[PDB]
Design a protein around this ligand. Structure first.
Ligand SMILES: *[C@@H]1O[C@H](CO[C@@H]2O[C@@H](C)[C@@H](O)[C@@H](O)[C@@H]2O)[C@@H](O[C@@H]2O[C@H](CO)[C@@H](O[C@@H]3O[C@H](CO)[C@@H](O)[C@H](O[C@H]4O[C@H](CO)[C@@H](O)[C@H](O)[C@@H]4O)[C@@H]3O)[C@H](O)[C@H]2NC(C)=O)[C@H](O)[C@H]1NC(C)=O
Ligand code: HEM
Ligand SMILES: *[C@@H]1O[C@H](CO)[C@@H](O)[C@H](O)[C@H]1NC(C)=O
Ligand SMILES: *[C@@H]1O[C@H](CO)[C@@H](O)[C@H](O)[C@H]1NC(C)=O
Ligand SMILES: [Ca+2]
Ligand SMILES: [Cl-]
Ligand SMILES: [Cl-]
Ligand SMILES: [Cl-]
Lengths: 464, 105
């Protein structure tokens, strides 16, 4: 049992504890770790590889599911309205919450006994991991139902299946737009955006759209953005008393906070009007995730950065210089060379003391150590890996929103007007929201506008 | 695969008509570089006491975290040009792209 034992026997690969650890004094203890399922269990032929349970495509599978029985179960099959199922016990000031899941060992119930609020059911199994994530899932559920409702008014003869599919297509396109127009340019910065995501031309059926094993580790750069609190703000964008800043180690799996502490509006305001954490070389990731990850629900607090490194080993990922080489970037061999690459000899020396050679630095560690690209939030190595993956997901998706045949020209024109602030206006009680770009805007009231200034999605071109 | 279709499948099957599992769920990841395991094919670096990687001892993941990642939370620098929504969209997006399953306890 990898959760309760420190024995290293398959499928367990527990993290051992160093001497003088700041938290775990017993060196016979361990941080629990299950090896990722192998694609070919028990093989003496294959080189072990791991499995992606989801669709690689940017298709909102986190809302709809990636397997047919789950996808059916997420739908409201009581009627012909093409809706997703909503919570039958609770609403958030008259607006929909996600349905509850039925888990054997439900971790959300552990976070508050008296509340008895279980985990939510969504297209992905992680939707209750933090209330900020739950809030985004809930926002997309509402948006689906809003579109299906509007499409039924527009097209009264459409059946449930048609309504569901047309609203699903729109939600997928909105996720693609927000991601490629607004989010990625701010991850990569302008030079890397131009290099790895040049202007879209059309679908190329020879582009492999799979997620690469390395991207599952590299895209964890986002752990460096995480703040140690969940911030909740009222309708004046002021701290919502009496607990406006909850430590992250008391929000993991805390679905009760969404249901019984004010719904999604205060959380979404907190996200818009609070800065992200900046990744700096001596401020890489916070202790709420390095020391106290899932502390409420488990026998010991996990260390997310450490898990990332153990995971890259579990997955057999090459080290830092091999990935530099893959990307066409120079590979440092000495502490002096690594210091140049990092603009930081102190950090280079610390890395060499742990790893001996930059050949052996784990990909997450090396990737998050590099200085950030201009107007981006990753360095050159992570920019290459991330930018390369997202180009494949775009050019290799037959259902990419701009590909001819997916939407009409008029539907594409209407879709181009969407924004995440408008989606928030349409599906919540929030009336003042971030100015575009939402991912940059972070200070109230300077960067905020009223909802009435934002164009809403015009569905006229969906009338048949 | 249907020769015409209008909507995505739920599993992602049939997006690529020539290789119809590509991007579909419950399939192996693509490798951009060949894997590196202690025995070549299955055991991870750090599995076997005393086995070096490319000439050097393997650092404990928790030691690296302690020595390089750990910092005093009061030093946290807020990003003047990104919101926390920038973090949160990333996580939500990751959950559209990949989930790597593990065996139950
Ligand atoms: C559709 O997309 C595919 C795949 O493209 C790759 O992914 C895209 C997302 C994008 O990043 C592309 O830049 C990227 O290549 C395209 O097909 C690839 O096309 C390239 C270029 O022809 C092929 O590369 C060649 O590979 C050969 C060995 O396998 C190699 O010998 C060739 O190198 C020789 O020739 C060059 C030029 O003379 C010379 O400079 C070299 O020094 C060497 O002698 C060259 O590297 C890929 O293998 C192709 N990949 C696949 C899967 O087929 C395709 O062109 C594109 N089509 C359109 C219309 O966009
Ligand atoms: C908002 C809070 C975040 C978390 C809580 C969280 C936690 C995890 C955990 C527990 C894993 C698995 C660790 C392991 O290997 O055992 C995990 C993996 C992934 N991260 Fe995490 N993280 C949160 C936040 C983010 C952000 C902001 C991300 C990106 C911008 C992000 C990415 C991911 C990815 C891609 C993975 C691997 C997923 C897979 O199974 O393939 N995280 N994080
Ligand atoms: C199905 O939709 C109807 C109409 O909106 C609603 O009354 C009912 O609660 C929905 N059922 C579920 C399980 O979401
Ligand atoms: C548990 O939930 C209730 C609301 O049901 C709340 O009043 C109580 O403070 C919560 N417990 C903790 C430890 O936060
Ligand atoms: Ca997907
Ligand atoms: Cl329910
Ligand atoms: Cl408001
Ligand atoms: Cl890979």
């Amino acid at each position: 049992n990898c959760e309760t034992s420190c024995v290293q026997q398959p499928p367990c690969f527990p993290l051992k504890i160093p001497p003088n650890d700041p938290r775990i004094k017993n060196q016979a203890d361990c941080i629990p770790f299950f090896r990722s399922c192998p694609a070919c269990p028990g093989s003496n032929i294959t080189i072990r590889n791991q499995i992606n349970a989801l669709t690689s495509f940017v298709d909102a599978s986190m809302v709809y599911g990636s397997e047919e029985p789950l996808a059916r179960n997420l739908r409201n099959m009581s009627n012909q309205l093409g809706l997703l199922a909503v919570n039958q016990r609770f609403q958030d000031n008259g607006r929909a919450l996600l349905p509850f899941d039925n888990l054997h060992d439900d971790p959300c119930l552990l976070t508050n006994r008296s509340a008895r609020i279980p985990c939510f059911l969504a297209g992905d199994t992680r939707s209750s991991e933090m209330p900020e994530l739950t809030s985004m899932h809930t926002l997309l559920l509402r948006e689906h139902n809003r579109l299906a409702t509007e499409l039924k008014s527009l097209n009264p003869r459409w059946d449930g299946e048609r309504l569901y599919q047309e609203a699903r297509k729109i939600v997928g396109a909105m996720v693609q737009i927000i991601t490629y127009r607004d989010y990625l340019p701010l991850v990569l910065g302008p030079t890397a955006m131009r290099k790895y995501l040049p202007t879209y031309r059309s679908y190329n059926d020879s582009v492999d759209p799979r997620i690469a094993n390395v991207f599952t580790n590299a895209f964890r750069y986002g752990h460096t953005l995480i703040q140690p609190f969940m911030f909740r703000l009222d309708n004046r964008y002021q701290p919502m008393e009496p607990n406006p800043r909850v430590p992250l180690s008391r929000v993991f799996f805390a679905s009760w906070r969404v249901v019984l502490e004010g719904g999604i509006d205060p959380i979404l305001r907190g996200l818009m009007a609070t800065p992200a954490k900046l990744n700096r070389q001596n401020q890489i990731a916070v202790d709420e995730i390095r020391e106290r990850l899932f502390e409420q629900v488990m026998r010991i607090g996990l260390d997310l950065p450490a898990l990332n490194m153990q995971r890259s080993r579990d997955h057999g990922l090459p080290g830092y210089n091999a990935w530099r080489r893959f990307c066409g970037l120079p590979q440092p061999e000495t502490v002096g060379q690594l210091g140049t690459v990092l603009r930081n000899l102190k950090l280079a020396r610390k890395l060499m003391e742990q790893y001996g050679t930059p050949n052996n630095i784990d990909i997450w560690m090396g990737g998050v150590s590099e200085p950030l690209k201009r107007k981006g939030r990753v360095g050159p190595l992570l920019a290459c890996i991330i930018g390369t993956q997202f180009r494949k997901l775009r050019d290799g998706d037959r259902f990419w929103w701009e590909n001819e045949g997916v939407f009409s020209m008029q539907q594409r024109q209407a879709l181009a007007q969407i924004s995440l602030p408008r989606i928030i206006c349409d599906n919540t009680g929030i009336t003042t929201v971030s100015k575009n770009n939402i991912f940059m805007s972070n200070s109230y009231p300077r960067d905020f506008v009223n909802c009435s200034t934002l164009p809403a999605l015009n569905l006229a071109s969906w009338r048949e | 695969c249907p020769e015409q279709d209008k909507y995505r499948t739920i599993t992602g099957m049939c997006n690529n008509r020539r290789s119809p599992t590509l991007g579909a769920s419950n399939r192996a990841f693509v490798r951009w570089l060949p894997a590196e395991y202690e025995d070549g094919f299955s055991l991870p670096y750090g599995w076997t006491p005393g086995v070096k990687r490319n000439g050097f001892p393997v650092a404990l993941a928790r030691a690296v975290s302690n020595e390089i990642v750990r910092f005093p939370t009061d030093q946290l620098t807020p990003d003047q040009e990104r919101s926390l929504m920038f973090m949160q969209w990333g996580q939500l997006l990751d959950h559209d792209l990949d989930f790597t399953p593990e065996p139950a306890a």
